[model samples]
Target chain A: SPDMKLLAGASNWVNQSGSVAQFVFTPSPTQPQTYEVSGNYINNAQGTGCKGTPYPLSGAYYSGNQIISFSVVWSNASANCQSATGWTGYFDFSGSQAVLKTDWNLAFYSGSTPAIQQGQDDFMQS
Target chain B: VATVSESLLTE
Candidate 1:
């Protein structure tokens, strides 16, 4: 199954400035349709908006056509964290790790004209 | 590791 195959194990996405986003995907054995996602981000003040802190993230994800999409409703977020409610993004592995890329969109809350920020991170599967 | 690229848009 391409969906399960996309995010079946632990993967680490490292960006420039030595920052890392680690993801652990655990799909339910009984209900393969559902899965648990958790991870932490080691942010570096390179070119991204996120502060240089380790933020814990929790979310759910599913898969399709070499793409694993998910959303996280961040908790215990400090002022450093940009997104208000949460963030959503997707990973496109492109047929068995031939091409790995990920992108996410975050919207800030509090301004009349909210600013939406999007970031791209390359993927690496271990 | 790759360089992080960010784009901002007003919504």
Candidate 2:
């Protein structure tokens, strides 16, 4: 099942900011091509800001052309800078391992100032 | 800037 493709297992991923994280997804059995996304955004000094904590990541997978899009809402922050990040990309299965090539949008506020960022994802799947 | 759910880029 194509559903099993994205929902059956979790994966390790790296964001453009070099923050390492996990992608734990649960497929909705009754929904066509839908999954729930969540994971821990392990902090990197290079990243905007946040602790190595569990974040609420949300978004959907588009079956058309195998496009996968998702996001993480760092709403659980009292820290200086917090971002709600979203990613857009697809998978490449051209080798011994699969690769997810994606770009992300990170929007956040630092104290009273707001800013936005964009970056990519590094996939770790075999 | 647009939020994650309401992202501007359609990619």
Candidate 3:
């Protein structure tokens, strides 16, 4: 009895080119070994003084009995004027055939503060 | 004068 599935994602836009940011989750079979994930991001240039950084990404795998969890966040706008002004996160999974969870939170006021995150997991198999 | 607010929580 170990068939669970859950996933989440978040981003703000501004990679300019190549891997601006992306995340996807899909599970529903059983046999997975373990899994966990978390998220967060911020930074929205406005007055010329911009700042952005919050790269968090988790991983997991399996498909025989089901058991997959995942997470991801983007906004690594170090230079190039930096970008993004919002972000979010979520994802969960348990043992015994089907148990997923999530909380995904995202907000934006106008300039800066988008820097909050979270994550967790537990795949059965011992 | 840039302003921005963001939130992301999970449990």
Candidate 4:
């Protein structure tokens, strides 16, 4: 199946911020062809101000050849920042190892001040 | 499953 080719079993990945993220893609055997994406973001002290802790995440993905697309959301909090409605990203999985081009948009309160951060980053499967 | 070579060049 093309969907299976896109994502099957466990896939380990890392983002541009040096934060480690993972995804387990499970293909369903029914109509509408749904898949579950579950993983955690291992924090790094690079960008995004992510603290060094694992943040659990979940989302859904669909099939494609040159581009397997998906969306995900995760939340976290600390003394300096807290996500509002969680951080969301629309990602495209491509290349031989399914490298990700993530369009990330996050809204959070930084020390009681509202802020928005948006950018595109890469995540390569390992 | 094949071992995949991953690359990410953003910081």
Clashes of each: 1, 0, 19, 0
lDDT of 2 at A22: 64
Provide the lowest-lDDT 10-residue window in model 4 chain A: A78-87
lDDT (Cα, tens digit) per residue for candidate 2, span A3-111: 3464554666664455665666666566676666665656453424455655656666655455677777664543323447778888766666666788877786545
Error of 4 at A35 (Å): 1.2
lDDT of 4 by residue, A1-126 (tens): 433543654666677667667666665556255666666666563544435655666666654333333433333442223342233344444345556666656665544566666666677766
Return the TM-score for candidate 2, rounded to 2 decimals: 0.64
List the candidate 3 regions with Cα displacement exceeding 4 Å.
Answer: A1-32, A35-57, A61-69, A75-99, A105-110, A115-126, B1-11
lDDT of 1 by residue, B1-11 (tens): 32222221111
Deviation in Å, model 2, residue A113 alpha carbon = 5.3
The candidate, 1 or 2, that scores higher on TM-score is: 2
Q: Could you give candidate 3's per-residue lDDT for residues A1-126 as a string of tens digits?
A: 222312333322232221222333434245254333334323332332323454544555443443333433323434322222222222222434322322332322224554432322222121
**DockQ order of candidates, top first:** 3, 1, 2, 4
- True A-B contacts kept by model 1: 0.00
Candidate 1's error at A73, in angstroms? Answer: 5.9
- Give lDDT per model, in order: 0.51, 0.58, 0.32, 0.50
Better structure of 2 and 3 per lDDT: 2
DockQ for all candidate structures vs. native: 0.06, 0.04, 0.08, 0.03
The positional error of residue A5 in candidate 1, measured at the CA in angstroms, is 9.7
**Residue A95 lDDT, candidate 2, scale 0-100:** 64
Docking class of 1: incorrect
Best by lDDT: 2
Provide the lDDT at A39 for model 3: 43
DockQ of 2: 0.04
